[PDB]
A paper describes a structure:
Yeast Rpd3 is the founding member of class I HDACs, which forms two distinct complexes: the ∼1.2 MDa Rpd3L deacetylating histones at promoter regions, and the ∼0.6 MDa Rpd3S targeting transcribed regions to suppress intragenic transcription initiation. Here, we report the cryo-electron microscopy (cryo-EM) structure of the Rpd3S holoenzyme binding a nucleosome at 3.7 Å resolution.
A mononucleosome containing methyl-lysine analogs (H3Kc36me3) with a 70-bp DNA link at one end was assembled. Sensing extranucleosomal DNA is achieved by Eaf3 chromatin binding domain (CHD) and Rco1 EBR. Eaf3 CHD extends to and separates from the Eaf3 MRG. Our newly defined Rco1 ABR (50–67 aa) extends from the Rpd3S core and anchors onto the surface of the acidic patch through Rco1 R61 and K64 residues. The nucleosome acidic patch is important for binding many chromatin-associated factors. Therefore, ABR is involved not only in the recognition of histone acidic patch but also in interaction with nucleosomal DNA.
Residue numbers in the entry:
A (entry chain C): 12 to 118
B (entry chain E): 35 to 134
C (entry chain M): 50 to 67
D (entry chain N): 13 to 44, 52 to 131
E (entry chain F): 21 to 102
F (entry chain D): 29 to 122
G (entry chain B): 22 to 101
H (entry chain A): 38 to 134
The structure:
DNA sequence: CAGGATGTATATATCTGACACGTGCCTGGAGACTAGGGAGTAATCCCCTTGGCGGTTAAAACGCGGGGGACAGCGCGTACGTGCGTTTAAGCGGTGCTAGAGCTGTCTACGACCAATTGAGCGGCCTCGGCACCGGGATTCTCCAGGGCGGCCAGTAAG
DNA sequence: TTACTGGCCGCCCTGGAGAATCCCGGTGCCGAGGCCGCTCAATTGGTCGTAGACAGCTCTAGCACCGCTTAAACGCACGTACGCGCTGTCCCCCGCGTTTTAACCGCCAAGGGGATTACTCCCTAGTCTCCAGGCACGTGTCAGATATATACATCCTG
């Protein structure tokens, strides 16, 4: 019979197979259901399809096509809920989100 | 008489605050850092060799720790209503976090 | 102002591209 | 080096060039490797005050002041650099110190 | 053998950070004080970093190691090694 | 000498949501390490869930309960609404 | 149960902070603390319920709250 | 009549509390506070009388830590009386905002 | 041959076996070495053989023979070398170490 | 239920002192947490090094990461005694 | 300094509900024996850190004024704490009810496992366009010297 | 006698003079990415063994309510300590030249150690069988809670 990749049937972009192995190898539980990978690739594929579209819309505003960490650091700290998910993470080459306390500004 | 046109004390720093937050390069000078890490690890286990990136990975984190400190000691210095930060704040902003 | 994201749209738009 | 009497008190200066005004063509150490002195014709755009020009003349660079700000002097303003010539600047400088304070007495009288 | 490197973190390099942080005026004592903090932070990360390196019996501290020592303390790092 | 990664996938998604933009290496190795972080929290969460309830295995539900704890706020109501939409399509297509 | 956060009294907060170490408590705290305590429970409960809602149970038992607290980093001891 | 100067009873109230471990938040007003929060997450919940305690002993401690941090922030600002400025700072610096 | 418990053979008091069975079923790894649990049993002892020690002294200095949860909260918050191991954890019914800042005191 | 085990220790270190039925709960809730942290760190440590099996050396290295300072010295000094004593018989 | 008043600490005695020990029990652990699969052990090699060399210039150190913030002092007035009196509802102890937690038994659907198959994603090569860089005008930002503007007395107009 | 406009001091925003920064027009540079083998991990087709899904049932533990004591809350009064706003003082850090320095770059190398295979071995998982240590329940003295009634302890407040 003809081979249809399991990532196709789910319609996902991330690979469901490669996850379905990683759940076994990482020793997360003694058995892994067939529903977990398909469900776990979607969530990943959703999030990774979130930071990017945000990063992209940050790239266009700096008049650069390509995404670079400085764009990512801007896409994550601006958003309020992504920042809360990655609260502890420190992005390499990331730079900081521009912020000056109002008391310091001259007058 | 004789005026060199010196900017007002306070507006060079804000300027260069606006210049660094925008930029993203590394601030702590690379080589004098590397000679520090090699010197710290020389204490815990003699005769180590550091992979190139493994030195970079530290400096990338050591910076973004201090910057996380200053951006949090400043909030303490704004708090006493003054502008100039002072060691009696980095002594605070590290005990509030509980990291001590 | 020279470097800006301007924060176009923040609230989620669930995969209209699907 | 040189010192330039600017009004009341002088300041620290450096000889930017050495010029014979009778030759009407100045010799200067160019900027940077060591740049050997070159004898160049006096600039028409360049203006010379007479005191510098009667005797041997020389354009100067003040220490602490930017080159764009830096300007000319006379020669009576210039006495050869000497610790004694530095002292008189300081005496005037001290005399300039309370000069702001002596004026402030009128402001002290203004406030009270 | 290496000695006296902490004073290698140049005094401007302390303010150049602090600018990016967002402070305007910096007192005189901060400079000498900050080194005291950064040195504490390395003796933590480096140590945990060394321990893994000793563990796999490999002499060279792998870049992947430092990402772990950080991940344990709570400051995850993205982009180096993975 | 192969170190498998998500460099192909993240790049494929990027074309779906920005048919022009492309991503640079040092920015990819972030995403390649962001996923390997999330996928190690979610799974690492639905490993304790199954253990607590004494269920031996890990199934999808145990992932919903794993997502609705980590992903904060609006993401939780979008991820699980994006997860089920996948798994429902999968089983019905098998 | 329309307003129960007004049930955590003024002497309730005053008693707590007295244990904390303060001396004089400014008036606007007694209201503002309620804002903190509320947004603390809304995080601890919303996790405790999810563990419960998963196991199909209808009771948020202590073995849940200890778990919900653990992810918060505020590990709790003495219950399980 | 006889009165203590301001503050002298405050310290006496501290050593009378920092030496004791009894629960400070009144219980039956807390029980009704937890129930109210649970509703908008799920309806008809039933809490084990232990799991209302385990919340209280947690949310009491959370606050006592917060108040120590605010007291530090106020001793820093050079005044004695904590204030919402101090609360908000002691939360922002913790990063638990 | 009479059975001798691994815990007793090693001279320890904590159950080597019960720790061993826990290490297997927790899904930490596919295989657990023979010497792994006995080592972990000892490390568990010394952490209880010290907290129960410091708390044990708290009873004497407080004149109550039975150790109540406060006597734990005084054994760990006094000792720095232990406090960092117990940084985030809360102890129920533990109270707080008694102190007051210098500015507060009259 | 590590409580019987805890009592055996306490009655050793203090032949007279007793333990309340809530402390046991603290300890039974405490030992389990330390054991989870250590054995959890041990599992992650073997995964980084591609090793399949947790062994005696994995736990020792797992300790020196968690226990701060002086505890790391005496714990691993205690652990090595147990293995050598066990391996003796 | 002198001295009453107060609060906590201290002593003696009286109960209890509660933790320590006893005893029975059964379920997890110890004995005993493999099996192959993971782990250690030996060359090897190559690529990748450590190490030195010299130019060079970006940057760190150093020097000085003075401009502005740190800090101390002070006046104060109000938002606090303290105490009383009243009034709430919290805690205790019961009575009665039942959702629902926990546990059993049955057995079907589900996932582990395997052989053969195949194409997805890997490493490697190669390229040309996105972008870093530099140059010099154009444009913006900042600082400051000179400049219209109410608040007073002086002599104003006068009941 | 009363009455109060005018004059002079009072003192801004605004142009300029720079510096800093942006714009844009080239000008190379190298890695983003596209393409090409290929191999090894995912896929497919089948079996087997059981985890848990499901149904039913036994009792716990929770909910509801309620009536009583009384301790905690609440509101009012008051008096005063402190947060704070103002002034004044001065030191110390920012700003900007100079002067020294050592990071950097690029460049070469050498040998060291991390990364393959081969091999061989020995150790833990798996399994079966028997039994005693840990658990649950019972109980029974007993150290701690509790009531009451001294002995100083600090605190004011003269």
């Amino acid at each position: 019979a003809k081979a249809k990749t399991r990532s196709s049937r789910a319609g996902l972009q991330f690979p469901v197979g490669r996850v379905h192995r990683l759940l076994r190898k990482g020793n997360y539980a003694e058995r892994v259901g067939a529903g977990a990978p398909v469900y776990l690739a979607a969530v990943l594929e959703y999030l990774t399809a979130e930071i990017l579209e945000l990063a992209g819309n940050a790239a266009r505003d700096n008049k650069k096509t390509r995404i670079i960490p400085r764009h990512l650091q801007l896409a994550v700290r601006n958003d309020e809920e992504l920042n809360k998910l990655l609260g502890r993470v420190t992005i390499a080459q990331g730079g900081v989100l521009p912020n000056i306390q109002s008391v310091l500004l001259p007058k | 008489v004789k005026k060199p046109h010196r900017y007002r004390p306070g507006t060079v720093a804000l300027r260069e605050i606006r210049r660094y937050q925008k930029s993203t390069e590394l601030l702590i000078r690379k080589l004098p850092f590397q000679r520090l890490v090699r010197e710290i690890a020389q204490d815990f286990k003699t005769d180590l060799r550091f992979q190139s990136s493994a030195v970079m990975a530290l400096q990338e984190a050591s910076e973004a720790y201090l910057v996380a400190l200053f951006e949090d000691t400043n909030l303490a210095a704004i708090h006493a209503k003054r502008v100039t930060i002072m060691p009696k704040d980095i002594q605070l902003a590290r005990r509030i976090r509980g990291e001590r | 102002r020279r470097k800006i994201i301007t924060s176009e749209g923040i609230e989620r738009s669930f995969k209209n591209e699907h | 080096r040189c010192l330039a009497f600017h009004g009341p008190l002088m300041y620290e200066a450096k000889i930017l060039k050495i010029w014979d005004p009778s030759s009407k063509m100045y010799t200067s150490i160019p900027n940077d490797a060591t740049k050997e002195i070159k004898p160049q014709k006096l600039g028409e755009d360049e203006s010379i005050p007479e005191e510098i020009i009667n005797g041997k003349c020389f354009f100067i660079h003040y220490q602490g002041w930017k080159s764009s700000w830096d300007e000319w002097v006379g020669y009576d303003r210039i006495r050869a650099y000497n610790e004694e010539n530095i002292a008189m600047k300081k005496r005037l400088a001290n005399e300039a110190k309370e000069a702001k304070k002596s004026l402030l007495e009128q402001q002290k009288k203004k406030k009270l | 053998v290496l000695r006296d490197n902490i004073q290698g973190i140049t005094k401007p390099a302390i303010r150049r950070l602090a600018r990016r942080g967002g402070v305007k005026r910096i007192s005189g004592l901060i400079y000498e004080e900050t080194r005291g903090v950064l040195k504490v932070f390395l003796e933590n990360v480096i140590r945990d970093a060394v321990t893994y390196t000793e563990h796999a019996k490999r002499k060279t501290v792998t870049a992947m190691d430092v990402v772990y020592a950080l991940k344990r303390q709570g400051r995850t790092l993205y982009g180096f090694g993975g | 000498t192969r170190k498998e990664s998500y460099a192909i996938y993240v790049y494929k998604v990027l074309k779906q949501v920005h048919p022009d933009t492309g991503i640079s290496s040092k920015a990819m190795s972030i995403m390649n390490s962001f996923v390997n972080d999330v996928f190690e929290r979610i799974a690492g969460e639905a490993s304790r869930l199954a253990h607590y309830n004494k269920r031996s295995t890990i199934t999808s539900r145990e992932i919903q309960t794993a997502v609705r704890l980590l992903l904060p706020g609006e993401l939780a109501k979008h991820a699980v609404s994006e997860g089920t939409k996948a798994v429902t399509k999968y089983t019905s297509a098998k």
